[PDB]
């Protein structure tokens, strides 16, 4: 938890962060794909059902 994760994945752990938090402000990115970042922002987590993608051809005569 102290090692590398995403920057937000240490924001909700051991609030002291104002020395290590400002460190990331000098040249850093973040994409997503954690678990707690996606739950804070409102996106589907990548485990479970979220890791499937559907596709379907659209004539559909009912019969």
């Amino acid at each position: 938890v102290g090692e590398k994760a995403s920057v937000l994945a240490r924001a909700a752990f051991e609030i002291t962060t104002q020395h290590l938090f400002a460190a990331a402000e000098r040249g850093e990115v973040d994409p997503l794909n954690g678990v707690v970042e996606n739950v804070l922002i409102g996106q589907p987590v990548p485990v479970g059902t979220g890791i499937v993608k559907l596709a379907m051809s659209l004539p559909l005569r009912p019969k």
């Binding site: 402000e25 739950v39 922002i41 409102g42 589907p44 987590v45 485990v47 479970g48 059902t49």
Partner: protein, 96 residues
């Protein structure tokens, strides 16, 4: 009119099953969801204008396609706190 809460332990149990869809519905959707217009090449939150009915982001003037983004109201306030300091939270969106 209150019951019990869904805190730390209740999120980790639903993840274990793998219920992604069920999760989202339970913890966020039963609050407020606010829709904001983000600029694509700037990253800064745009700005409306009523009476004329249009959007407009600061640096680039209307030409650049601005896009709608749906997020929890709680998270929008969190960006502001960083924005009140000298930190820039560029939101780089990505297509469907």
């Amino acid at each position: 009119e209150g019951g019990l809460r869904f805190g730390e332990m209740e999120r980790d149990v639903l993840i274990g099953h793998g219920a992604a869809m069920l999760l989202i519905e339970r913890l966020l959707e039963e609050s407020d969801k606010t829709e904001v217009w983000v600029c694509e090449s700037c990253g800064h939150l745009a700005l409306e204008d009523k009476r004329r009915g249009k959007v407009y982001c600061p640096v680039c003037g209307e030409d650049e396609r601005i896009s709608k983004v749906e997020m929890s109201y709680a998270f929008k306030l969190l960006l502001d706190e960083l924005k009140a300091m000298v930190i820039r939270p560029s939101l780089r969106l990505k297509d469907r």
